[PDB]
Write a new protein. Structure first.
Length: 207
């Protein structure tokens, strides 16, 4: 499956793509403003994620640090990124269908649109200025807007038992981005796409 990852931000981002225990394609790449990076994701990929990382520094070996979404200091991500990270999540060829969503469960750093480039389904978008409107207690000094679980580490925010409800913090992400997951047990905003669809992830789709 092809994913075109497009940076429409006015600033450089370092795209990342991983399934948690492995990189997807090269796992990461620098994208200057306006740049597009096309990756190939293995059919059947379950629990894949794509995200942007901001304010990165990498040495000649591809080792360094990012202010948001750092994946163990590597340019080419093999694991998930450090929150806050707006996440494009997907599971492909799951009983003949693909499933896509955008999640704010691990916070938000950059606005995003995640849409199929093929027929048969609608895209999802979280393009609002969540960082600018971020509640004081969720603001991440290094940039972005943390989810409540990251900040507070409570059973209620982290939905440890699977018996949690919405909160003042989850309602904030939900109000700004109705189409993205705001907490673990949020009413699913997952989109069902034909199996083997192709996609485009766009950072800063509006600005």
């Amino acid at each position: 499956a092809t994913f075109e990852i497009v940076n429409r931000c006015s600033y450089t981002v370092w795209a990342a793509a991983s399934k948690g225990d492995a990189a997807l394609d090269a796992g990461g790449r620098q994208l200057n403003s306006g740049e597009s990076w096309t990756i190939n994701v293995e059919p059947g990929t379950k629990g894949g994620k794509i995200w942007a990382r901001t304010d990165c520094y990498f040495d000649d070996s591809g080792s360094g640090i990012c202010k948001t979404g750092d994946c163990g200091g590597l340019l080419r991500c093999k694991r998930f990124g450090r929150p806050p990270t707006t996440l494009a999540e997907f599971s492909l060829n799951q009983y003949g269908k693909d499933y896509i969503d955008i999640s704010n469960i691990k916070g938000f750093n950059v606005p995003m649109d995640f849409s199929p480039t093929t027929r048969g389904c609608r895209g999802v978008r979280c393009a609002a200025d969540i960082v600018g409107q971020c509640p004081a207690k969720l603001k991440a000094p290094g940039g972005g807007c943390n989810d409540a679980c990251t900040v507070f580490q409570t059973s209620e925010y982290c939905c440890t038992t699977g018996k949690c409800g919405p909160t003042e913090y989850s309602r904030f992400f939900k109000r700004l981005c109705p189409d993205a997951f705001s907490y673990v047990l949020d009413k699913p905003t997952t989109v069902t796409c034909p199996g083997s669809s192709n996609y485009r992830v766009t950072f800063c789709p509006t600005a």
